[PDB]
Design a protein around this nucleic acid. Structure first.
Ligand SMILES: Nc1ccn([C@@H]2CC[C@H](COP(=O)(O)OP(=O)(O)OP(=O)(O)O)O2)c(=O)n1
Ligand SMILES: [Mg+2]
Ligand SMILES: [Mg+2]
Lengths: 557, 406
DNA sequence: GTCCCTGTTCGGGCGCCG
DNA sequence: TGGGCGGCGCCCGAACAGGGACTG
């Protein structure tokens, strides 16, 4: 039936008018299904016939529904949606099974004809006008308008969610010991009551929904495990994801790689160790959903590993709030991280990955910090608590990094875990110049118009070196100068540069970079035993800087 | 009777998403909002109000009492003609000169005054739920909200009537209202000052934080003193003086720069010549003078820059234009061995903002040396003021840190 | 001013839920 | 033929913004 709840007042945007769009042609199949739906809806007051006094129309169609021979009626309200007012969306996230607590008794209900039981604002109905055709040259046309929430309108999901909440409010208020997870029209209902008392309370809930116009058909009333919910199978002590099937394509298209990566991301919540870096790389230069992409050998390897991962039986458990949350992180290659969240050693609540690349030049300590913050926020959403961390980084490494690093950084309570690969800094810069170590003054210059450049060094021991470069820039040539000095110096060296750019990259101790040249610089820096880097202002006649400056300038006028 | 409030011309209301809350803050907000709804201070709304402002909760120190805090920064930006121009409050230059300034939370007063009905939609906020058990529950204010620039503006006339007798009787105490608080300053001795404060409270029956702004001095730029100078030392000195001359144009460098001629080892020692010695002493002197041509512009916004100097030390500068500092200073802490950079940084932001409110009646816009996600994950764990400044996230250039270090 | 480099935001594919 | 709506997620690339270095 139709809920007696007040309607939500809804407006068009200022100066706009309802949609006037012709109706498409439709299959005989879809026409028959739509007339069968609309005669029943008009009989039930959910839609009303309209005449020439309504100057509006929007195309209608239908699609098969998930697990039925039944049809869903849709309206291409894109035009009305563009002209309809903004809403504030109340669905703030997707509930997750690992945030559920064990319950003695569990029920899942599905509200019948959910949208079509919530009434629509009296003043807004004329705009929902549509029409069913008999055939392009057969008959006039059905020509109804909506009295309830239609499927296709941008306003229907929020208005339904808010209405369902208003309706559940008194029941929640007088049943604090029953938990109702409310996602759009599906209700998970858990309690610690004995099966008899729980079923009486369920019947109360269903009668209460009826009083507000909402049916819960028995065909969709789940009463025994496993419960089907939000994409999972809920058993009494564990949950699983309904099966993830990956494509087995021979040729691969961009759309296919999107589908593959998307299923892998969905699987990574419970299946541990999923990686998608190489598969994702396959998307960089693309320009069409239909472009065929050949898998690199690295992508081949990654995909095979993910397949073998997915052939394993896996399950999650439920949250016990009287125990600690523990998040454990493992480094994988190439800016990828896996984690498991659990409360008892080998019993994961869930798993996850973090592989977002941030920064031209970064290191493993920055990435690990980013992963800790992501896991923290995700945990606050799911459980309202921050987890205790088990991390593969030494307390000393973290102390050194936070001491020497000039940005505020912080990581909540954590304990070290000694399973490699460990997270280390691979070199330290000295805080003071090194006695005895040769002092290299480096510089580089580049011609803005010709792109030619020079890089080189002068040392306090008399050594000079200049190399010419093509297709370069000032910043590249300053990095070249530093690299040159690192290559040519002994295990201990002092380096004086005038480029804030290069100083800034190197003081942050990167261990990986998007630039091949910075990677070469990093390999050299790791080979050294002591490195002291110093900065002087350019073009001030300072020290050895002036001599190198003159040396690398035959492309500065 | 309500006061009609308009938005700035051409601007819409705030549409700011709600960030995740811990369970205990959600529980506190749900308690607080049940009480507020019952009292008529707020009402449930639905999704056809398109506006949203984030909400969270803070705990008073040594208290078990949670406080609801609404981040009205966007709404404040979008009503800025109303509260700054139409119904503004002037700022007294003597407040910063007093022996003692006490801060009094007067926010409750606003809940007695009704808010204009056309404007209530803009005050919408949304309470979230653990693990998205439920869609968000939405409310809007029916009364002047704490944290809105419009509330002290509208309540100005009542506050002036309330303070007229006390001001008349105590004419050397200055009282300045900023947003939720009264700043009450006097030159009394601390014993008699406190009684005068716990005299104004009795009056205001129609906590407190103690401040001594007459002792707020400026952090001068200073140069190293050493009896043995290396090539490295002098290179560092010349670089720093070179940067400093963008502020003090009298800084001269050539006599020190001349000591570095040639291609020398960083560690080799260099005696300072008489010329260079005198140049250095003259530079030391120049740094002690006030910066020339710094005039506060009350129309433009304040910029506050912060640097982490390490080991619990922070430096900060308040300016409106580059190299023209209105204030510099530091924020120091003992070596804690359980040090929290985020907590220290929010404490520093609050101290700096307090100082700006006392000196200019203005909070500054902060350039914060932290990743956005770290700060957004943890700052509300340590916040204790009712106001919130604007801020943005910066990667401090290492040289700049080097220049203001102590 | 111009050029180089780097970081943020946002839309537009796909995945999952309903 | 599929075709509509809201939510969250991931990854990429285009569009900007901001700051350092440079030209004559
Ligand atoms: N692709 C979709 C799927 C669903 N929805 C909306 C949201 C939930 C509501 C359910 O309506 P509904 O008539 O009860 O349909 P259901 O499939 O739940 O069937 P039921 O009545 O329980 O047999 O529809 C949508 O807009 N687009
Ligand atoms: Mg249904
Ligand atoms: Mg140079």
């Amino acid at each position: 039936p139709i809920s007696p709840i007040e309607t939500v007042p809804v407006k068009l945007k200022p100066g706009m008018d309802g949609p006037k769009v012709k109706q498409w042609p439709l299959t005989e199949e879809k026409i028959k299904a739509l007339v069968e739906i609309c005669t029943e809806m008009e009989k039930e007051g959910k839609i009303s016939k309209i005449g020439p006094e309504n100057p509006y129309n929007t195309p209608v169609f239908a699609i098969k529904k998930k697990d039925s021979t039944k049809w869903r009626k849709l309206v291409d309200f894109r035009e009305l949606n563009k002209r309809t007012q903004d809403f504030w969306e109340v669905q703030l996230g997707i509930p997750h099974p690992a945030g559920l607590k064990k319950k003695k008794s569990v029920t899942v209900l599905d509200v019948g004809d959910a949208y079509f039981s919530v009434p629509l604002d009296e003043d807004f109905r004329k705009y929902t006008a549509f029409t069913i055709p008999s055939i392009n040259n057969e008959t006039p046309g059905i020509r109804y308008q909506y009295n309830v929430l239609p499927q296709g309108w941008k306003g229907s999901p929020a208005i339904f969610q808010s209405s369902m909440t208003k309706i559940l409010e008194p029941f929640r208020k007088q049943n604090p010991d029953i938990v109702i997870y409310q996602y759009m029209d599906d209700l998970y209902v858990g309690s610690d009551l004995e099966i008899g008392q729980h079923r009486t309370k369920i019947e109360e809930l269903r009668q209460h929904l009826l009083r507000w116009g909402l049916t819960t058909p028995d065909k969709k009333h789940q009463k025994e495990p496993p419960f089907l919910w939000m994409g999972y199978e809920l058993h009494p002590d564990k949950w699983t994801v309904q099966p993830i099937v990956l494509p087995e394509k021979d040729s691969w298209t961009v759309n296919d790689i999107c589908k593959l990566v998307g299923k892998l991301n969905w699987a990574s919540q419970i299946y541990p160790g999923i990686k998608v870096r190489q598969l994702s790389k396959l998307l960089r230069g693309t320009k069409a959903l239909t472009e065929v992409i050949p898998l690199t050998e690295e992508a081949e390897l990654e995909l095979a590993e993910n397949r073998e991962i997915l052939k394993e039986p896996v399950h999650g458990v439920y949250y016990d709030p009287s125990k600690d949350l523990i998040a454990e992180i493992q480094k994988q290659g190439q800016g990828q991280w896996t984690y498991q969240i659990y409360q008892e050693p080998f019993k994961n609540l869930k798993t996850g990955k973090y592989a977002r690349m941030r920064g031209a030049h970064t290191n493993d300590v920055k990435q690990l910090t980013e992963a800790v913050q992501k896991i923290t926020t995700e945990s606050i959403v799911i459980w309202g608590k921050t987890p205790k961390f088990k991390l593969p980084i030494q307390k000393e490494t973290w102390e050194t990094w936070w001491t020497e690093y000039w940005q505020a950084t912080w990581i909540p309570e954590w304990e070290f875990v000694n399973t490699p690969p460990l997270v280390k800094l691979w070199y330290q810069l000295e805080k003071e110049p090194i006695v005895g170590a040769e002092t290299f003054y480096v510089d580089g210059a580049a011609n803005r118009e010709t792109k030619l450049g020079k890089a080189g060094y002068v040392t306090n021991r008399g050594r000079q070196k200049v190399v010419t470069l093509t297709d370069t820039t000032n910043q590249k040539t300053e990095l070249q100068a530093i690299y040159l000095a690192l290559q040519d110096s002994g295990l201990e060296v002092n380096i004086v540069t005038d480029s804030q750019y290069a100083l800034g990259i190197i003081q942050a101790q990167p261990d990986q970079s998007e630039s091949e040249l910075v990677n070469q610089i990093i390999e050299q820096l790791i080979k050294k035993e002591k490195v002291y880097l110093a900065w002087v202002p350019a073009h001030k006649g300072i020290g050895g800087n002036e001599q190198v400056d003159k040396l690398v300038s035959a492309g500065i006028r | 009777e309500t006061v009609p409030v308009k938005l700035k011309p051409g601007m819409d209301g705030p549409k700011v998403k709600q960030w995740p809350l811990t369970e205990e803050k959600i529980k506190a907000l749900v308690e607080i909002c049940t009480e507020m709804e019952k009292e008529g201070k707020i009402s449930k709304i639905g999704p056809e109000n398109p506006y949203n402002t984030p909400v969270f909760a803070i705990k008073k120190k040594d208290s078990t009492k949670w406080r609801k805090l609404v981040d009205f920064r966007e709404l404040n930006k979008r009503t800025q003609d109303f509260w700054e121009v139409q119904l503004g409050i002037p700022h007294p230059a003597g407040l910063k000169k007093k022996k003692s300034v006490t801060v009094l939370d007067v926010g409750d007063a606003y809940f007695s005054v009704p808010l204009d009905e056309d404007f209530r939609k803009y005050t919408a906020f949304t309470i979230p739920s653990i693990n998205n058990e439920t869609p968000g529950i939405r409310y809007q204010y029916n009364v002047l909200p704490q944290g809105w620039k419009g509330s002290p503006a509208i309540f100005q006339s009542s506050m002036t009537k309330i303070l007229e007798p006390f001001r008349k009787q105590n004419p050397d105490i200055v009282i300045y209202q900023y947003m939720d608080d009264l700043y009450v300053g006097s030159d009394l001795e601390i014993g008699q000052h406190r009684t005068k404060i716990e005299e104004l409270r009795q009056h205001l029956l129609r906590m407190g934080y103690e401040l001594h702004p007459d002792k707020w001095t400026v952090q001068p730029i200073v140069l190293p003193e050493k009896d043995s100078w290396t090539v490295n030392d002098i290179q560092k000195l010349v670089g720093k003086l070179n940067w400093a001359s963008q502020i003090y144009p009298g800084i001269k460098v050539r006599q020190l720069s001349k000591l570095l001629r040639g291609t020398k080892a960083l560690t080799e020692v260099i005696p300072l010549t008489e010329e260079a010695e005198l140049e250095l002493a003259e530079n030391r002197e120049i740094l002690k003078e006030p910066v020339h041509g710094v005039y506060y512009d009350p129309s433009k916004d304040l910029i506050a820059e912060i640097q982490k100097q390490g080991q619990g030390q922070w430096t900060y500068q308040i300016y409106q234009e580059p190299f023209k500092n209105l204030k510099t200073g530091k924020y120091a802490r003992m070596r804690g061995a359980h040090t929290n950079d985020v907590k220290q940084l929010t404490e520093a932001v609050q101290k700096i903002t307090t100082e700006s409110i006392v000196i200019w009646g203005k909070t500054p816009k902060f350039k914060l040396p932290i990743q956005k996600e770290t700060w957004e994950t943890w700052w509300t764990e340590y916040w204790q003021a009712t106001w919130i400044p604007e801020w943005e996230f910066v990667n401090t250039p290492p040289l700049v840190k080097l220049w203001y270090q102590l």
